Amino acid sequence: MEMEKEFEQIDKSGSWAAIYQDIRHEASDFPSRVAKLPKNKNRNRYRDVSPFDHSRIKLHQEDNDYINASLIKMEEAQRSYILTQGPLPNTVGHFWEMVWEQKSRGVVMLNRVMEKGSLKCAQYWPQKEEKEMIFEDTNLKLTLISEDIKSYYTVRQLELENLTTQETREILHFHYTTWPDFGVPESPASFLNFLFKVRESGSLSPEHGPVVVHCSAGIGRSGTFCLADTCLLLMDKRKDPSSVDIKKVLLEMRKFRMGLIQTADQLRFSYLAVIEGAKFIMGD
Numbered sequence: 001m002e003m004e005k006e007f008e009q010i011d012k013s014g015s016w017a018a019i020y021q022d023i024r025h026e027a028s029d030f031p032s033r034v035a036k037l038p039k040n041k042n043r044n045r046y047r048d049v050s051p052f053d054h055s056r057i058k059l060h061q062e063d064n065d066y067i068n069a070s071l072i073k074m075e076e077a078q079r080s081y082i083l084t085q086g087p088l089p090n091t092v093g094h095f096w097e098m099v100w101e102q103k104s105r106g107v108v109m110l111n112r113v114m115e116k117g118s119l120k121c122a123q124y125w126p127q128k129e130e131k132e133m134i135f136e137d138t139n140l141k142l143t144l145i146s147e148d149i150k151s152y153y154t155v156r157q158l159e160l161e162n163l164t165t166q167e168t169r170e171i172l173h174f175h176y177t178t179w180p181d182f183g184v185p186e187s188p189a190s191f192l193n194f195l196f197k198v199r200e201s202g203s204l205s206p207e208h209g210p211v212v213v214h215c216s217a218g219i220g221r222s223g224t225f226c227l228a229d230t231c232l233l234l235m236d237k238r239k240d241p242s243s244v245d246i247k248k249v250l251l252e253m254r255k256f257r258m259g260l261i262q263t264a265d266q267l268r269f270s271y272l273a274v275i276e277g278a279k280f281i282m283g284d
């Protein structure tokens with residue numbers, strides 16, 4: 001069923017809360033035993049948001065390999081994403097170790113460091129060229145190279161150095177700065193513009209490791225970003241673009257990380273972004 005018609009049918013019937021609860025009921029449940037070990041309590045921002053054991057990213061160290069991060073592998077779309085929490089004071093070194101070990105080109109940040117008057121994630125990147133950051137626990141150095149500030153997002157060029165081998169890589173930081181403190185954006189125009197800028201960078205492409213995507217918990221806004229990208233790619237690839245079922249793509253993604261899309265408003269916004277974005281994909 002053409003999702004644009006399914007959309008008007010749910011809107012006119014005001015049944016978004018009912019569709020959303022149906023997804024919550026059918027979603028996969030897999031063990032998260034490593035996340036719940038007592039040694040890992042200060043590595044988790046939220047007690048009710050954990051990576052599944054089968055899809056968790058492992059740090060390459062014998063001490064403690066744990067980080068709150070999941071690999072979302074979309075077989076038909078041929079895209080992979082790492083979804084993670086906003087880093088905490090005691091996990092900023094682990095975060096950059098993961099970026100290094102997984103060979104990521106891009107980091108996508110969908111939150112502000114402070115929202116609703118509380119800290120939603122650590123200041124994990126340098127704000128001035130001449131004041132670089134050293135992570136002594138993982139032996140990495142991070143320098144700000146350049147910053148391009150626009151009305152709805154900021155793009156930064158960063159240099160990550162492995163202090164053990166003196167190799168360096170360029171990382172791109174894509175920072176969506178205008179998601180509102182409550183609810184979802186009124187139009188998806190600026191969110192789709194942002195997604196097309198990440199794609200244009202090469203950060204989502206198979207020659208690199210998976211893109212790292214985060215918000216505060218790494219399930220809500222993060223979920224919206226990867227769901228919209230995957231649905232638009234499948235509409236490009238298939239003979240029948242109307243066959244793309246957003247609820248079925250979301251359930252496939254929930255096999256890899258719990259809770260993706262946190263509200264009925266985020267589900268509705270995801271439909272709107274795919275419907276408005278398709279009017280480019282189908283030749284405009």
Ligand SMILES: COC(=O)c1ccc(S(N)(=O)=O)cc1
Nearest residue numbers: 088089092122123133134135
């Ligand atoms: C190496 O860098 C750090 O050790 C570090 C720790 C915490 C914060 S934070 N959460 O206060 O912003 C920022 C940076």
